[PDB]
Write a protein that binds this ligand. Structure first.
Ligand code: MN
Lengths: 144, 415
């Protein structure tokens, strides 16, 4: 392992700003096997990117990766049988919801492809939640 | 009031043409205790915004805003690595495996639009980024091939000047002129024609004679053949909401008789105008060269042609009074119609006036084209600051005085 332990040593320049940062850090450091480390390294990098992007905009990080139905049912709100979708960042106030789905694409073409796909899959949900429920405002944060 | 429930639920799109104005005026002035408040309340703290908006709309003359504010106040609106690793930042839609009909990243989706012209509205096609780059590499390859070509006149001013001077000498000599205008050039051609043409060709190298294989060109041309175009929505509400029309009949046959509402159009022969200009240019050029070679070998009369991918001009140099050759002209028309090059009835095939790119040439001189330039000068006042406007007027007046209009007129334009 010429670079594995090298990576472990050099990833020590990270600030555990949030609790989940340390929670994933300790699991990554306590697991050295060929099959996982790439997967959880990619997921921790993506979590860091999405955390920066969303607490750029008054975030409430989704540590459970649950659906919109359960978070809407956490308080007293009827279920309109909403289609399933996993949100990245949610902020509900009164009877309003702010939805943020972020991503990263180094090439433009894929960037607008993902932007259009996300915009389309977030617009269709408003037609169902407004009929017998509350609103939402979809915001998309795309980083090149 | 309740009809919004069965119909669309958006209160901001309710049209005023369904209800009378008297009922709207009298209804908003009814009893309302907790829906209005005293005073304008310019401070507008949070929590009472609807009441302030209703008061501001009511104190004004308009009541439709008051009516919709009342409506919205009343609450009438009630461990694998291939599936679990494609949601964080993985670019699953990257083009890695492609078929003859797609590219694993879409289907070259296009949008239809218009562009105003003097005669009739011109088609326009707008492409997404991926299909734009694909058609644009096709464009680059085709301009390269046409740059290798000699007789084309689309982007080479030297050949355009050569055609102009040949036309002038031809008119001065008594040459036979054929100004061919092709009808429905855009919506008639199909990519499959280009597929066959490039399959049958060889495209030999200059020194290597290696017979370049255009496999990527063939695959991308098949992609273009499998492009899908999205109909503008405005016509969708225009036809759905609801004179006999064929397209309206097709829409009325295809909302629920076969499937859902039509939103994406897919067919064989489109050749979107503004997308495959130069490939069609080279195809037309080589076909016209074949036709003129055939005319030379059959009627022993010497042809030359110039093509601009939409219209062409052919000069016929004659051996050895102009009524003995209708037959070869009908024959050429027939052979062109055998190809996908239908000729519009606007073509004139005599020997007194020649046309190409709206630049007429007559025996002795050239038409000045006065009123066209005058009208162009009077129009297109592209105004941002007076200085740029003076510059543009100067350029247009220079262009106008170039074609011998007058100098007592440019003074009036300046005034
Ligand atoms: Mn013409």
């Amino acid at each position: 392992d010429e670079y594995v332990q090298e990576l472990k040593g050099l990833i020590r320049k990270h600030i555990p700003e949030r609790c989940e940062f340390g929670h994933q850090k300790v699991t990554f450091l306590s697991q050295v096997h060929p099959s996982p480390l790439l997967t959880e390294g990619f997921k921790l990098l993506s979590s860091l990117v999405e955390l920066e992007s969303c607490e750029a905009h008054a975030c409430q990080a989704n540590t459970d990766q649950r659906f919109v139905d359960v978070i809407l049912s956490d308080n007293g709100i009827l279920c309109p049988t909403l289609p399933k979708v996993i949100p990245d960042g949610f902020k509900l106030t009164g009877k309003t919801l702010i939805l943020l789905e972020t991503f990263v694409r180094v090439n433009p073409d894929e960037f607008e492809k993902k932007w259009k796909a996300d915009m389309s899959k977030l617009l269709n949900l408003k037609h169902d939640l407004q009929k017998s429920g509350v609103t939402l405002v979809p915001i998309v944060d795309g980083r090149s | 009031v309740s009809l919004h429930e069965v119909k669309d639920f958006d209160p901001d799109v309710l049209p005023p043409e369904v209800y009378k104005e008297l009922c709207d005026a009298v209804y908003k002035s009814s009893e309302k205790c907790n829906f209005f408040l005293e005073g304008v309340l310019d401070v507008c703290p949070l929590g009472l915004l609807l009441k302030n908006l209703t008061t501001s709309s009511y104190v004004d003359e308009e009541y439709f805003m008051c009516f919709k504010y009342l409506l919205i106040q009343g609450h009438f609106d009630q461990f694998t690595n291939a599936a679990l690793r494609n949601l964080c930042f993985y670019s699953e839609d990257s083009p890695t495996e492609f078929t003859s009909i797609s590219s694993n990243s879409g289907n070259l989706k296009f949008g239809l639009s218009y562009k105003e012209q003097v005669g009739s509205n011109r088609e326009l096609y707008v492409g997404d980024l991926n299909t734009k780059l694909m058609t644009r590499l096709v464009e680059d390859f085709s301009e390269a091939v046409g740059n290798s070509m000699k007789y084309t006149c689309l982007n080479s001013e030297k050949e355009f000047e050569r055609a102009i001077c040949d036309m002038k000498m031809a008119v001065n000599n008594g040459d036979l002129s054929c100004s061919y205008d092709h009808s429905k050039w855009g919506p008639t051609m199909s990519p499959a024609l280009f597929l066959a043409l490039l399959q049958m060709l060889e495209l030999r190298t200059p020194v290597d004679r290696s017979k370049i294989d255009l496999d990527s060109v063939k695959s991308i041309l098949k992609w273009h053949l499998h492009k899908v175009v999205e109909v503008p929505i405005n016509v969708a509400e225009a036809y759905c909401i609801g004179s006999t029309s064929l397209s309206e009949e097709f829409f009325h046959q295809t909302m629920q008789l076969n499937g859902q509402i039509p939103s994406h159009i897919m067919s064989v022969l489109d050749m979107g105008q503004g997308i495959l200009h130069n490939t069609s240019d080279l195809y037309g050029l080589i076909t016209e060269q074949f036709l003129c070679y055939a005319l030379d070998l059959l009627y022993d009369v010497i042809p030359v042609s110039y093509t601009s991918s939409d219209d062409q001009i052919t000069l016929i140099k004659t051996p050895s009074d102009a009524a003995e050759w209708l037959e070869m002209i009908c024959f050429h028309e027939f052979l062109s119609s055998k190809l996908n090059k239908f000729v519009s009835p606007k073509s004139v095939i005599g020997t007194f006036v020649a046309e190409f790119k709206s630049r007429f040439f007559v025996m002795g001189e050239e038409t000045p084209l006065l009123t066209k330039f005058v009208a162009a000068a009077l129009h297109n006042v592209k105004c941002k600051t007076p200085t740029q406007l003076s510059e543009t007027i100067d350029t247009i007046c220079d262009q106008c005085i170039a074609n011998g209009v007058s100098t007592k007129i440019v003074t009036r334009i300046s005034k």
